[PDB]
Design a protein around this ligand. Structure first.
Ligand SMILES: Nc1ncnc2c1ncn2[C@@H]1O[C@H](COP(=O)(O)OP(=O)(O)O)[C@@H](O)[C@H]1O
Ligand SMILES: Nc1ncnc2c1ncn2[C@@H]1O[C@H](COP(=O)(O)OP(=O)(O)O)[C@@H](O)[C@H]1O
Ligand SMILES: Nc1ncnc2c1ncn2[C@@H]1O[C@H](COP(=O)(O)OP(=O)(O)O)[C@@H](O)[C@H]1O
Ligand SMILES: Nc1ncnc2c1ncn2[C@@H]1O[C@H](COP(=O)(O)OP(=O)(O)O)[C@@H](O)[C@H]1O
Lengths: 382, 351, 382, 351
């Protein structure tokens, strides 16, 4: 009987579920030994690690440090970004720097430092193979979260609740990937594996923008062929969609068309912007067409963003029990609970993919996490 | 009387409130034996950084991060961010993607912090002097002497005393009124960021006055710079807007330099503590002009006669910048002063 | 026989036809007394005058001085904006000011100064009442442009060619205007005629943006209720649509949502942004509804831009002879000639409304004008 | 020999080309009697502001409007805008919504203008001196003396002579090589906009060194300022990029101040004309240090002995700014010099 049932088991340990893990810690401090919340998180990766694909070593963050794992839920937290700076002695230098936006690498080390303090909360290298329901009076009292190590042994994690923050996955029509057709996230692990070349960047958003620039880079004498404030007050009021349920960068804008202009002016165009079918990759690149030009090159990157993992497999039996919309997409409650019915007594909660897609995110990770934890504690008693 | 306190502080504006906040976060973490007993005495009957309690609706040129507490402890319940959270404006502000809040928000934040720390302060008390408590020509502690609005006198034993009485307008020979804050065919004033007053004056005739980036804020507003150069440029054909703004001698006008056409304007300097010191003023080291020297721990430099400390939290230089006493080190200096007091409290004294 | 036939008669004398008038002058200088182009322009207004509706006295121009009447066709012209500065002694102060964008008022005086030198080229207060064709062998050799003074007398202007730059007109569904329902252009002539109030600004673009701000303004303690680089390289190459024929301001963005934010923060909201039928104007404002809220106020402004004058009336008989698209909209040649057929021997050319709408313009006034004039001179001989 | 020309000019870089352009636009407007006969003599065999003829692909920090001609006559066929029109790049540039062209475009523009004015210039001619042509101790005009690459000498009568030989690197006691333009474990240099060289150095160890807005450009690049402060800030943990950039004594290193670890870098100064003047140098007024005084019309101040003028177009101060001799007044000063020459050509002489 080494596995009694936990209050919560979370699947995945990226930021989203780390943010939650933090609130479980801060909650346990305020409450006594009788109201502790017992949370375990399971990460398939052997160690904590956000995205390896966009580590452009001197990019600044598109988002303000205030959107860290914790602050929008609790601004007095030992695990805010400012708090991490204080422990590495950089708070003053950062406060003086008079910016909202640090480098993408400080957030990575911040994530690593948060994930490090909360290391007891997680088993890494454990891949969840299913959430199977534990039934009594035709009621699912709790779940056996089943996990597999990298050496094959299977484990059981009883939990009244399950939280899904498995992260997301590359994407609408194009459904293939070889040795010469990459996704925007593959660019670093592959640039470091190709060594005058030719590229093509289908895409949208800053994702596709960032490749056209680095394909230039301190790098290529070759060809590369491309194919803030609106949400500062579209957020507006702290009310959101509770009255109704009752992708550009000005600096990169100019930097790239500058390159095209200056290259038009001086003739030596490393760049070629394009505006407006099948692909036939042989060994000499690819024979993909556009409405018509069966353009060919060496490699062809994209940027149609990311999408949340589909949980049906993981749900197994329970997938059937979940309310759907008119398309069979999963409905989601206001407290981020999958809609299962009174048949199912515990909850299955969602961070991550909830509604949206396409964003290389953290917009509300902190507050959603705490709202979930309070939903879990409320359901445990008055 | 009282038992001797770890520190008695003079004044309760922003500077001393930061210290008070720092005193509290200390007393929580440490046991009941390492508690610091700090009292603050404020002459005004209520807290008010601005006694005019009716200021602007511009943004602050300083990032909210220079609040009473953050730069010493970013995990504090009394950060500006905490204050927003308590008003449910924390989300709106994060979305607003700014470093610089409105002038009124910081005022309200000061007021909100000063309310949480009401127990550490007595208002309506004007400290009139520190007479040294001596045995053997040695000052063991201080009697901070204060008088209410009714004349009654009270005494406060303290091993340490902290001065954060704030500052004073800087005026040379001429002083009149009929300063930069007091706001017709002629008035007067001047300043280096008086330009920041000059800008809004648009919309009557008045009279007033690189290698700068390394390591950042470790040392004028570019936007008002530009608005002013815009305004003067756009003002080809037509002179000054609604007034006649222009930038030395004395129904009264003043002449100025070789040829020249009663409120004032200038900068700031800290209150002189000599009066408050009385006897002890002479125990204090001075520079080659007799000005008060100040240690690294912000202690007045008093002889070995004096065993406790006299500290300065209220900023001690000629700042020339209102609402910038924060961009200094109020938070961190406060904590540094606080740490100085707990240290001299345990040493068995080896010189 | 006091009216022989002119090479060109132009209808209207705003910028578009003034730009053309200038090229007729510069052309006449280069050529001898035998190849002179005889151009007359007719303006209904009694004097030259662009838009009276957007004279916000310290706005800067949205467009660079290089887009003046002349420069993109001839950068060495005595009637560029820089040239006008030189004659008022402001060239150095302007050159030193190190900006591309002067105030909207300097362009107005520049327009007035250009229109002043070219004053011989125009009769003002003459309203064109029709372009009627002059026929011989079933061929229209030239046109009688017919014009009426403000005192009723009618005049005839024979011209081998006619150029239409009548300007544009307010606009999609809403087709009415009273004493309490304005267009974006009426705001000044009406703000200066109203004297806590209430407004409503339907609209789009910077047009509607500019009213929400001034309705605040150094003015109203009242309510106001709202309802660059992309074309720097979308222009790209100097090739345009000859391979294929073979609305925001960052400063105003922030300035307005700043107002809404600061007003949310401090409670005293003079502003109310809105996001997502019939109107029933009685004497107490108007009873217009939105999908539902039959909102009422004092006045309701719009900003659905402008559209070109429809020339069918002016064409009279000739309107029938003009090629149409699949909707009956007028087709337009590459040289800006209405498509009439070999029946019609002279041309009828178009500045202004050509294809687009919605813009409170000058983008190509200079080059289009010269292209038209050369089309007219080419058609006059080898 | 020649008949006496209105002006003979020394050198044919940017400064003197502006004048040459101004001389031409004059000769068009005026009749055949008021034509100005100007010759220019350039030592180099071909025009080249930069003799290295292989410069950068950055933008210019100066607006194209400071071209050879515009600020004197914005209606000129030899504006930068005209040059673009002639290459069909005028539309692309207007759409590009910039004031600042690429460094190569202005170079090519200079070359294009210098080609149109080939008739006004003789290349391969090194002017060696101005010997005064006297009758009655009075200098009526000048013999500009020049020698080709083959030693042959030629003479040029001119009522006026214009000096625009350009400038010189400024170096104190130490001069070596093994300057700011010439571009290992130690080199050397310095400057105020040497920072502009320091910036691109990123991507080996080297060694180098408000009330500013009224009325605008009537008096460092903020963007490179920021890139550098970014670079140093971002460089916490890791030192200098690819090198070891740092900012006085002499396989060779130099020590510097109290403690310190062969190309150079500094600013600029104009060529000294004393040699070229010879005899006449003494006819020229000087300041309290013997330096050449210069009139409002840019004339060397020579006595009433000398009836014609000697003018300076080649910028006469210590500029400290390459590619900024335009932000001066080349266009307008050129025209001002030209007007000075036509005026002294008609006066019946009343003093
Ligand atoms: N079935 C699974 N079992 C365990 N871990 C998983 C499973 N599916 C995905 N993961 C892990 O979930 C994590 C999600 O992290 P990430 O994608 O960075 O986004 P988030 O910030 O939303 O957590 C990844 O580390 C991924 O390896
Ligand atoms: N002798 C005194 N006794 C008590 N309080 C005093 C005395 N002199 C000044 N004060 C008070 O000290 C406070 C200093 O506040 P302020 O000038 O805002 O300081 P800070 O630099 O901390 O912002 C004021 O409220 C003032 O009334
Ligand atoms: N039938 C007409 N006869 C004469 N003038 C006209 C007629 N219709 C319009 N106009 C005039 O044409 C001019 C167009 O000017 P404007 O609208 O400023 O734009 P543009 O810059 O395109 O010329 C206006 O002055 C208007 O009064
Ligand atoms: N004694 C001389 N005779 C003829 N030409 C000379 C003499 N000395 C210098 N020059 C030439 O004068 C020109 C000055 O050009 P530059 O330095 O570019 O001047 P600017 O300040 O006009 O840009 C150079 O081409 C240089 O070769």
């Amino acid at each position: 009987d080494s596995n009694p049932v936990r209050d919560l088991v979370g699947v995945g340990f990226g930021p989203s579920n780390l943010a939650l893990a933090i609130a479980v810690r801060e909650h346990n401090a305020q409450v006594g030994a009788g109201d502790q919340v017992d949370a375990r998180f399971l990460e398939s990766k052997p160690a904590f690690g956000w995205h390896r694909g966009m580590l452009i070593d001197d990019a600044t963050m598109q988002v303000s440090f205030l959107k860290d794992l914790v602050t929008q839920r609790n601004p007095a937290s030992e695990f805010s970004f400012l708090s991490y700076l204080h422990s590495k002695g950089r708070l003053v230098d950062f406060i003086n720097h008079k910016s909202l936006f640090p480098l993408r690498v400080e957030f990575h080390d911040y994530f690593e430092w948060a994930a490090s303090h909360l290391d007891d909360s997680v088993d890494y290298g454990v891949e969840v193979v299913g959430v199977e329901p534990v039934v009594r009076d035709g009621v699912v009292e709790h779940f056996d979260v089943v996990g597999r190590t990298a050496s094959g042994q299977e484990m059981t994690y009883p939990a009244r609740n399950v939280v899904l923050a498995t992260g997301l996955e590359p994407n609408p029509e194009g459904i293939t990937s070889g040795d010469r057709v990459w996704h925007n996230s593959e660019l670093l692990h592959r640039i470091e594996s190709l060594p005058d070349e030719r590229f093509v960047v289908v895409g949208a958003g800053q994702s596709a923008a960032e490749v056209v620039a680095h394909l230039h880079g301190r790098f290529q004498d070759a060809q590369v062929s491309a194919v803030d404030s609106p949400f500062a007050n579209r957020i507006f009021d702290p009310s959101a969609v509770d009255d109704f349920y009752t992708v550009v960068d000005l600096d990169l804008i100019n930097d790239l068309y500058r390159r095209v202009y200056q290259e038009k002016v001086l003739g030596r165009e490393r760049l070629r912007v394009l505006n407006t079918l099948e692909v036939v990759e042989t060994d000499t690149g690819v024979r993909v067409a556009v409405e018509k030009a069966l353009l060919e090159s060496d490699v062809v990157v994209y940027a149609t963003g990311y999408r949340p993992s589909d949980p049906t497999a993981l749900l197994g039996e329970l997938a059937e029990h979940c309310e759907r919309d008119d398309q069979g997409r999963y409905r989601v409650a206001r407290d981020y609970r999958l809609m299962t019915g009174s048949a199912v007594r515990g909850g299955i909660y969602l961070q991550g993919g909830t509604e949206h897609t396409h964003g290389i995110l953290l917009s509300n990770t902190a507050v959603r996490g705490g709202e979930i934890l309070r939903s879990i504690v409320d359901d445990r008693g008055t």
